[PDB]
């Protein structure tokens, strides 16, 4: 299902890549996207898939475009166009300087200070979940840890009942990895209908939870509106429910296949932070974009106003020009270059929370379950979209090789 090639786009720049169903997905989602970095592919190409849009394939261009919000606006940051136009989350649908004050408020509820304060609960939950699974000798990692660990921490931060997780997780996933069951707008609206009642309650009887803080915050020297709080909380729900949740599975899948890397972190724990960064590079998973504010010649390519351009955060770190032997995991890389958490004015505010959750998981999991692997004959499948993920990850291990703390 390709859209007619626009007049201004040269045929030699055409490369029909589908970000929601890459042809080489069976080899791994990152590998599937890396086909865009083969020698036969230009640095900047146009795909006729998903309505038609540009795709920057090199880290240099991706970074450049994310810095130049003047030409590349966040007003319509998602592909397809229908999703990008319906998307109105704050601050991700705003350009500087309008995003400034909202970004500051969001930083108040998920910033480093909050993460350091919540570290004890994060550690507590990781240890509890892992210790419960340890003597079982098996688990379905996605539903047994990848999901409950980051999600319960977020629901605690936001003061939301855990009973609502199933409902919320379904909706956030419809936005990032569309099922065709409902439009982007419908999923977004459902999320808003859930928040509206809560925000109204929190504005009346304020609490100390993340939603209360956002709902009663100040922006531009004045009170934040019910609508703006809703648009901010919508983004927080996606960050809490569909980011780290997916990344942990890519990382655990790799570790299950690499005894050498597991042993490495076990005897050299101080390398965990660096391992976290290298895994964030190798298993990068986000891909959003921008919209051209006007006609513009970018690196010899003529872009037209209204054109959408995908700037895959995932691709920068896999670019061989940024990291030699990009598909190889090396915890000792002199410089782990990547844009996994974004680049520019919208650099992820939850990156500190994400790193803390990843580092705690690596340390606590390897301590109790140092030796494990993917279930026999199990064929792991990945899924692609705005945020990519792992369908299922069955792991197995000899309980006799585990350690209780």
**Separation CA 388–CA 177 (nearest Å):** 8
Tell the smallest beta-carbon distance from residue 397 to ligand HEM (Å). 25
Tell the smallest beta-carbon distance from residue 66 to ligand HEM (Å). 6
**Separation CA 201–CA 160 (nearest Å):** 13
Q: For the stretch 217-248, what's the b/e string if a residue is b when 16 or more beta carbons lie within 10 angstroms of its beta carbon?
A: bebeeeebeeebbbbbbbbbbbbbbbbbbbbb
Give every CB contact of residue 307 below 8 A, 6+ residues apart in sequence.
Answer: 53, 54, 291, 292
Determine which residue in the list 44, 76, 110, 224 makes contact with ligand HEM, applying CB under 6 A: 110
Asked if 312 touches ligand HEM (CB under 6 A), the answer is no
Residue of 49, 349, 362, 366 with catalytic role = 349
Tell the smallest beta-carbon distance from residue 190 to ligand HEM (Å). 19
CB distance 17 to 55 below 8 Å = yes
Give the binding-site size for ligand HEM (rule: CB under 6 A). Answer: 28
Determine which residue in the list 50, 99, 174, 323 makes contact with ligand HEM, applying CB under 6 A: 99
- 93 or 323, CB closer to ligand HEM? 93
- Part of the chain binding ligand HEM (CB under 6 A), chosen from 162-170, 173-181, 191-199, 237-245: 237-245
Concerning whether 349 is annotated as a catalytic residue, the answer is: yes
**Separation CA 295–CA 293 (nearest Å):** 7
Distances (CA, A) of 38 to 31, 71, 232: 11, 27, 38
Helix (H, G, I), strand (E, B) or coil at 92: coil
Concerning whether 111 is annotated as a catalytic residue, the answer is: no
Determine which residue in the list 22, 240, 326, 385 makes contact with ligand HEM, applying CB under 6 A: 240
Tell the smallest beta-carbon distance from residue 335 to ligand HEM (Å). 19
**261-290 binders of ligand HEM (CB under 6 A):** 286, 288
Tell the smallest beta-carbon distance from residue 348 to ligand HEM (Å). 3
Concerning whether 76 is annotated as a catalytic residue, the answer is: no
Give every CB contact of residue 260 below 8 A, 6+ residues apart in sequence.
Answer: none
Determine which residue in the list 55, 105, 224, 236 makes contact with ligand HEM, applying CB under 6 A: 236
- 247 or 372, CB closer to ligand HEM? 247
The answer to the question of whether 348 is labelled as a binding residue is yes
Give every CB contact of residue 61 below 8 A, 6+ residues apart in sequence.
Answer: 43, 44, 298, 299, 311
Residue bearing tokens 């009942």: 161
Distances (CA, A) of 337 to 21, 215, 243, 326, 341: 26, 37, 20, 10, 12
Asked if 122 touches ligand HEM (CB under 6 A), the answer is no
Structure tokens at 290: 């921008």
Asked if 353 touches ligand HEM (CB under 6 A), the answer is yes
Concerning whether 348 is annotated as a catalytic residue, the answer is: yes
- Part of the chain binding ligand HEM (CB under 6 A), chosen from 9-17, 19-27, 134-142, 340-348: 340-348
Helices (H), 79-225: 81-86, 100-110, 112-133, 141, 148-158, 165-176, 184-204, 210-215
Structure tokens at 235: 């983004």
Asked if 340 touches ligand HEM (CB under 6 A), the answer is yes
Catalytic positions, written as ranges: 177, 242-243, 348-350
Which segments are annotated as binding site?
A: 348
Which segments are annotated as binding site for heme?
A: 348
Binding site for ligand HEM (CB under 6 A): 74, 77, 91-92, 99, 103, 106, 110, 154, 235-236, 239-240, 243-244, 247, 286, 288, 313, 340-342, 346, 348-350, 353-354
């Amino acid at each position: 299902n390709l859209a007619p090639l626009p007049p201004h786009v040269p045929e030699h720049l055409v490369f029909d890549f589908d970000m929601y169903n890459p042809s080489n997905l069976s080899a791994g989602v990152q590998e599937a996207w890396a086909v865009l970095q083969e020698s036969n592919v230009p640095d900047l190409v146009w795909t006729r898939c998903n309505g038609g849009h540009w795709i920057a394939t090199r880290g240099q261009l991706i970074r450049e475009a994310y810095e130049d919000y003047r030409h590349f606006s966040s007003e319509c940051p998602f592909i397809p166009r229908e999703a990008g136009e319906a998307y109105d989350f704050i601050p991700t649908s705003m350009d500087p300087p309008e995003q400034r004050q909202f970004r500051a408020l969001a930083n108040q509820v998920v910033g480093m200070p909050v993460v350091d304060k919540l570290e004890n609960r994060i550690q507590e939950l990781a240890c509890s979940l892992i210790e419960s699974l340890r003597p079982q000798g098996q688990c379905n990692f996605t539903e047994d840890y990848a999901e409950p660990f980051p999600i319960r921490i977020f629901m605690l931060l936001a003061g939301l009942p855990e009973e609502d997780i199933p409902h919320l997780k379904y909706l956030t996933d419809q936005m990032t990895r569309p099922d065709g069951s409902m439009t982007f707008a419908e999923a977004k609206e459902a999320l808003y209908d859930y928040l509206i009642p809560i925000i109204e309650q929190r504005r009346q009887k304020p609490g100390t939870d993340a939603i209360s803080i956002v709902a009663n915050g100040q922006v531009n020297g004045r009170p934040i509106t019910s609508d703006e709080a809703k648009r901010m909380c919508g983004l927080l729900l996606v960050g809490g429910l569909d980011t780290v949740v997916n990344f942990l599975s890519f990382s655990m899948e790799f570790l299950a296949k690499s005894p050498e890397h597991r042993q490495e972190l076990i005897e050299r724990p101080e390398r965990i932070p660096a391992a976290c960064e290298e895994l964030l590079r190798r298993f990068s998973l986000v891909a959003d974009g921008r919209i051209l504010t006007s006609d513009y010649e970018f690196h010899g390519v003529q872009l037209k106003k209204g054109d959408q351009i995908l700037l895959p955060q995932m691709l920068s770190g896999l670019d061989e020009r940024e990291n030699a032997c990009p598909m190889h995991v090396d915890f000792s890389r002199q410089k782990v270059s990547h844009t996994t958490f974004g680049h520019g004015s919208h650099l992820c505010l939850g990156q500190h929370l994400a790193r803390r959750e990843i580092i705690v998981t690596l340390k606590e999991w390897l301590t109790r379950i140092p030796d494990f692997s993917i279930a026999p004959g199990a064929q792991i499948q990945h899924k692609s979209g705005i945020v990519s993920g792992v369908q299922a990850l069955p792991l197995v291990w000899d309980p006799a090789t585990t350690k209780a703390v």
